[PDB]
């Protein structure tokens, strides 16, 4: 840690990340504007009740942060605690959100690597419509940036330069592997170990979001829960395995060094992206590094093992941490 280094490095990039962050709100600006007025119709401060404590909280809008699948995330200030949070709002199903709520908070209680929400709130019924915005607002720590936005930022201006920047790419690589190994240690699997769900927190720590999708390995579930471009072929109900997350780990490490996905897979927000929609579509299944930031040999090897097309042969993260390649990665980091 290492965490402190990433923390400072990120502070440096605050301004440009913010600009790329606003730019990504432009196309869905219609949804953002109308979610924003659904929650803050009149003024910048709304009183909500907690569905967990029954107490009130007063939340001032600071700015919209991000749009996802049927969701928008805002930065807000709790004006009694003088603390800032991310506030996530969902579009519309009532029963789906009830289940999401129970499962998210059950999973959170059961559990330093996963971003957990601290409250769930509703404008003064819960879960009913409040565009179709549900009356269910999820409060959690605000991240400095998610990896998907980081990659889009680097694609606009590559602010990871020279040796500090090389060190950051090494650190991200180690942190992605440690995080996936943590999951494995605990016999867990997450269908969305992907850049838009991987967060650099203000203390420089890398964390995984959406605790509700954190399952016991072997769990059977909707295959559609996996982003199609991050799904290996065996996901195209399915069994959620460590091999799914080894695959996704390989893809995210590739993007740290290369920004676009491998195999021609479509990577929105990256100018070098090709346009293969999924592995279900015919294409080049060869791993290619030609246009990446130059990678250390030991990284190209780790990526190649993670991205074995044979599921039974994929290197798992815990085992990767015992390989000479991982030891060298850590050794380089320590020394710098």
């Amino acid at each position: 840690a290492g965490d402190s280094f990433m923390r400072d490095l990120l502070k440096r990039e605050e301004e440009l990340i913010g600009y790329c962050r606003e730019e990504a709100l432009k196309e869905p600006a219609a949804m953002v504007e109308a979610v924003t007025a659904t929650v803050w119709p009149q003024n910048a401060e709304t009183t909500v009740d907690s569905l967990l404590s029954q107490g009130e909280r007063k939340l001032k809008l600071v700015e919209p942060l991000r749009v996802g699948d049927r969701s928008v995330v805002f930065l807000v200030r709790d004006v009694e605690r003088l603390e800032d949070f991310a506030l996530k709002v969902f579009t519309m199903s009532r029963s789906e959100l009830e289940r999401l709520h129970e499962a998210t908070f059950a999973a959170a209680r059961l559990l330093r690597r996963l971003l957990l929400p601290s409250d769930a709130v509703a404008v003064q019924p819960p879960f009913a419509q409040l565009y179709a915005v549900a009356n269910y607002l999820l409060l959690m720590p605000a991240a400095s940036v998610d990896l998907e936005l980081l990659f889009s930022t680097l694609d606009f201006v590559y602010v990871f330069r020279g040796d500090e920047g090389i060190l950051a790419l090494h650190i991200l690589t180690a942190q992605l592997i440690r995080l996936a190994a943590n999951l494995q240690s605990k016999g867990l699997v997450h269908g969305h170990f992907t850049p838009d769900n991987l967060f650099i927190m203000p203390d420089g720590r890398l964390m995984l979001g959406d605790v509700s999708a954190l399952w016991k390995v072997g769990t059977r579930g909707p295959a559609s829960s996996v982003p199609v471009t991050y799904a290996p072929r065996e996901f195209l109900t399915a069994t959620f395995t460590h091999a799914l997350n080894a695959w996704q780990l390989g893809l995210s490490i590739y993007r740290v060094w290369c920004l676009f996905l491998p195999f021609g897979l479509v990577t929105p927000g990256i100018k070098g992206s090709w346009k293969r929609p999924s592995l279900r579509v015919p294409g080049t299944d060869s791993l290619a590094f030609g246009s990446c930031t130059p990678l250390p040999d030991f990284v190209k090897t780790l990526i190649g093992r993670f991205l074995n097309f044979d599921r039974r042969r994929r290197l798992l993260p815990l085992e990767a941490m015992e390989t000479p390649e991982f030891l060298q990665l850590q050794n380089e980091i320590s020394s710098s």
Side-chain angles (χ1 to χ4, degrees), residues 34-303:
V35 173
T36 294
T38 301
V39 169
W40 289 284
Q42 192 191 90
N43 55 79
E45 177 169 321
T46 296
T47 307
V48 287
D49 301 315
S50 172
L51 300 189
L52 293 181
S53 74
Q54 304 195 45
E56 273 176 8
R57 306 187 65 160
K58 300 187 175 42
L59 297 175
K60 189 182 187 173
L61 172 67
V62 181
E63 66 187 17
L65 292 175
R66 208 74 161 77
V67 180
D69 189 356
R70 281 168 304 161
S71 63
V72 179
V73 175
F74 296 92
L75 180 64
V76 299
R77 181 157 189 81
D78 177 322
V79 298
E80 303 165 323
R81 301 186 191 188
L82 308 186
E83 291 175 308
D84 292 343
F85 298 80
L87 184 64
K88 175 171 187 166
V89 183
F90 299 83
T91 59
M92 283 164 124
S93 168
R94 173 160 196 184
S95 300
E96 214 185 342
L97 273 172
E98 294 178 3
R99 287 190 294 279
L100 177 54
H101 167 71
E102 293 289 335
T104 292
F105 283 95
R109 293 192 300 272
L110 207 61
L111 305 166
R112 59 195 174 280
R113 285 304 203 150
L114 298 141
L115 198 166
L116 299 176
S118 49
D119 201 358
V121 295
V123 190
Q124 301 182 335
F127 306 101
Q129 200 203 338
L130 172 71
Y131 271 98
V133 181
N135 187 19
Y136 179 78
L137 324 182
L138 193 67
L139 200 81
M140 69 194 67
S144 302
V145 71
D146 58 275
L147 288 185
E148 182 180 47
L149 175 54
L150 179 59
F151 298 149
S152 292
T153 301
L154 293 171
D155 196 44
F156 172 54
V157 181
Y158 205 90
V159 293
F160 285 179
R161 293 294 181 55
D163 300 1
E164 269 198 329
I166 290 326
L167 178 55
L169 303 179
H170 276 61
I171 294 172
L172 285 165
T173 302
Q175 281 180 325
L176 280 160
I177 292 159
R178 300 188 179 263
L179 184 54
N182 184 279
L183 262 42
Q184 187 189 345
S185 274
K186 293 169 157 86
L188 298 166
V189 175
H190 192 305
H192 208 125
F193 191 97
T194 68
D196 70 6
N197 190 40
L198 283 163
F199 297 92
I200 306 168
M201 303 308 280
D203 69 5
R205 274 191 187 296
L206 185 65
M207 289 187 112
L208 175 72
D210 190 14
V211 72
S212 78
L214 191 62
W215 304 337
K216 200 175 66 81
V217 57
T219 292
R220 283 193 75 80
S224 76
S225 58
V226 184
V228 71
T229 52
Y230 291 80
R233 308 176 155 298
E234 75 270 17
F235 284 75
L236 299 175
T237 300
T239 310
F240 288 68
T241 58
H242 293 316
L244 165 62
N245 286 153
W247 181 265
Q248 296 183 329
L249 174 61
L251 297 178
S252 282
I253 297 173
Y254 184 93
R255 293 203 61 193
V256 159
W257 292 87
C258 306
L259 315 171
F260 43 81
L261 286 164
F263 309 128
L265 283 166
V266 62
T267 318
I270 303 301
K271 45 188 227 244
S273 178
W274 296 14
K275 35 197 174 44
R276 185 191 198 169
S278 83
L279 288 174
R280 214 183 275 222
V281 171
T284 42
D285 289 342
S286 59
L287 187 55
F289 298 109
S291 158
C292 303
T293 295
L295 308 84
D297 47 7
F298 54 83
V299 174
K300 289 176 177 198
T301 291
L302 283 174
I303 293 170

Side-chain angles (χ1 to χ4, degrees), residues 22-34 66-68 72 131:
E22 318 167 276
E23 282 296 301
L25 303 177
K26 289 183 171 186
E27 278 185 353
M31 163 184 203
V32 180
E33 261 151 330
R66 208 74 161 77
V67 180
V72 179
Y131 271 98

